[PDB]
Design a protein around this ligand. Structure first.
Ligand SMILES: *C(=O)C[C@H](N)C(=O)O
Ligand SMILES: *C(=O)C[C@H](N)C(=O)O
Ligand code: NA
Ligand code: NA
Lengths: 295, 295
């Protein structure tokens, strides 16, 4: 029975306000520890990614759930997906509004429908058929987020390997600032925002959405690891393709079936946190990595 | 320069009856003809793939545009996507209602917006903006799918290689009969419903949209070519893999950057036709082909 691991990332974009970093740091730790706390009790790779991502949605410092950036009409529309490595089972929602937790709805899509993908009104209905609390829009909308939209008007993920050596991903996002209404990114789209397969590993992505879809970044990262490259080599290879081919930046986290993991980005920043052997690893900027004890 | 080629399909389905056999032949013949004429007139692969899919969207005999399957409510909900392998520019739309040509709306998302995928409410807002008319959903409803939905309770695509060397795909569908409101299959997801790359090939797929999405079928088929599998071996393994791993069945059409092409399927039947070197190739059944001359 293998040594478990969760990795966590928190949108990969431009440089961040130095004070806000403490708040971002503590958010990464929290998701990781929750994710790890779920593995600790021999809990599944699927159980774990979902719990980590639930925490970040609820954390307003991150652009998924509460903290979601705004669309062109000042509102919050959100995307998500989850995948089970074992039989490649999956669930996703795109363009949902006025619920708290997108990643759980995707899991509701995954295990409680014969389908994999619901969108907009059909998913607003499905959430209501599943007893999902509608929350006020003012709660999901923060102040910093109204500010970013004005200045333009002038993503989070988790991967995990459980004790049985199954793998899973979860990705969740409010989208991209000043996006059109109905705009779908790479997040809810299997093989682009994430992919998990026990025979390879699992990956969650963040970056220029369109560019992530265009190249299918998550499956591609995996294409390589099957070919024999390292996690770090494969992450290098795919992110560079996304830059060299479609002129797009982004970030990724992967853990393979051997339990080897890395977090790599061609964006300016990508806060990340991995937990493995009771030791938490954290970072926001390239080549500055801390390690602390997990209680 | 490259001799151009178009391959078309609807839909990797079950047994086809004698009366349907012939209309279906005529529809395929017409769509392959529209595409090849565009390529013979100097048009791009994208023009040619958009060309042929509109022909099957317009034709009531095919599950896409008019004649699409009806959802759970007795309403037509449509997905389509288009991709050029030159720069990986793409457009896609999900759960689109009350419109003739979802693929035409998919092209405009690629061409007129900074996005590559739109859905439902947002899909329609952008539609109305671009002047796409609104037609009563009823006018897409056929007594065939009407009957089929009452009973159930109790897909189209093309690949092209052009005289400039450009490849492309387009895919549109009404989905699976009686789908949940806002279910979204493969057909608008890049990598699943199709993929185009000027440096490898182009692929358009069909059948069970849930399975196609998990194995990332279209892009799976292209990794197999990248490893120097002929277009036939590449279809057979990637279809071979969906079958065993998720127990999915469907079919595809694929074209290499050099002009090699194939239609395989694992369902019982798949309408397909192909025009290259002045001839038409057509089928429904395994090796039922008739190769004629084309004026
Ligand atoms: C998150 O980083 C952005 C996401 N990839 C998207 O929705 O485009
Ligand atoms: C058409 O049968 C295939 C399509 N992939 C779907 O939505 O089921
Ligand atoms: Na959040
Ligand atoms: Na049709």
């Amino acid at each position: 029975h293998m040594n478990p691991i969760v990795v966590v990332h928190g949108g990969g974009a431009g440089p961040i306000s130095k004070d806000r970093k403490e708040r971002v740091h503590q958010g990464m730790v929290r998701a990781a520890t929750v994710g790890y706390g779920i593995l600790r009790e021999g809990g599944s790779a699927v159980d774990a990614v979902e719990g980590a991502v639930v925490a970040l949605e609820d954390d307003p410092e991150f652009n998924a759930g509460c903290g979601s950036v705004l669309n062109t009409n000042g509102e919050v529309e959100m995307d998500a997906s989850i995948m089970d490595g074992k039989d490649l089972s999956a669930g996703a929602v795109s363009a949902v509004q006025c619920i708290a937790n997108p990643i759980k709805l995707a899991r509701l899509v995954m295990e409680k429908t014969p389908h994999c993908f619901l969108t907009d009104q059909g998913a607003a209905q499905f959430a209501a058929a599943m007893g999902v609390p509608e929350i006020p829009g003012e709660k999901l909308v923060t102040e910093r987020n109204k500010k970013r939209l004005e200045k333009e008007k002038h993503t989070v993920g988790a991967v995990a390997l459980d004790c049985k050596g199954n793998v899973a991903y979860a990705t969740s996002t409010g989208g991209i600032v000043n996006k059109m209404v109905g705009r779908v990114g790479d997040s809810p789209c299997l093989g682009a925002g994430g992919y998990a397969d026990n025979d390879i590993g699992a990956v969650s992505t963040t970056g220029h959405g369109e560019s992530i879809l265009k190249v299918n970044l998550a499956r591609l990262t995996l294409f390589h690891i099957e070919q024999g490259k390292t996690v770090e080599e494969a992450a290098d290879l795919s992110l560079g393709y996304m830059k060299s081919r479609v002129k797009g930046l982004g970030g990724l986290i992967v853990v393979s079936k051997t339990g080897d993991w890395v977090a790599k980005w061609t964006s300016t920043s990508m806060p990340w946190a991995a937990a493995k052997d009771g030791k938490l690893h954290f970072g926001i900027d390239p080549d500055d990595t801390t390690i602390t004890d997990l209680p």
